[PDB]
Amino acid sequence: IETRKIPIPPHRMSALKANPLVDHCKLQVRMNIKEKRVELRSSKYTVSNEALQMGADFVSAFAMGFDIDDAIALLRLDSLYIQSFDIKDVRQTLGPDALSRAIGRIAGKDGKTKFAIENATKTRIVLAGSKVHILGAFENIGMARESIVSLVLGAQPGKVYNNLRIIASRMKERW
RNA sequence: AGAGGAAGUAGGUCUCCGUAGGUGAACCUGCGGAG
């Protein structure tokens, strides 16, 4: 019998108050968003370390910014992965015009560029300053990774988008 | 002005916060800060 306790950000707390995980994976939950903790306790109906770990990864992802839909998608699909990427990792220039210019290049106005990337490589990301959080199958995650590191290198968004399109297409092909 | 003659050229998204206004709890808008 094992228990996992997870801290939350103050951002998502109303959505956390919005609702079921005991029904989902038979694992008793306590919540206290004032100590920012969520307790996940294995009952006699909880069977697997797999179930505890997926509940933990799921609540951490929903806390880290994705919503209930891709969240229960991550719940449902054990193939799906998560990755947290800081913009402060490997860095092309030491100038601290990094964050503003870079994440402007990432989103574009109205999230056009990020959303084109989403509809291309079939992932789900969220952008908040230094962190970007990426969700889905790891190879798509890696394509998006190479895309974004090229974008923060400064490549033309349409150009890297085209390359991303064709690479995603040949990935999506089987033979 | 005149018919003739004769030639040549053809790129800040999402969440949260602090603001000002709106129709007020909420909520919307805009500004300014954090993830």
Swiss-Prot record:
Keyword Nucleus found: yes
Subcellular location, principal: cytoplasm
Subcellular location: Cytoplasm; Nucleus, Nucleolus
GO cellular component: cytoplasm; nucleolus
Domain annotation KH: ranges: 96-148
GO MF term list: RNA binding
GO BP of this protein: ribosome biogenesis
Keyword Lipid metabolism: no
Keywords attached to this entry: Cytoplasm, Nucleus, Ribosome biogenesis, RNA-binding
Record-stated family: Belongs to the PNO1 family.
The protein's assembly and partners: Component of the small ribosomal subunit, ribosomal RNA processing complex (SSU RRP complex).
Function according to Swiss-Prot or TrEMBL: Required for small ribosomal subunit (SSU) synthesis. Has a role in the processing of early nucleolar and late cytoplasmic pre-RNA species.
Protein's name according to its UniProt entry: Pre-rRNA-processing protein PNO1
Name of the gene this protein is made from: PNO1
Portion of the full sequence shown: 80 to 259 of 259
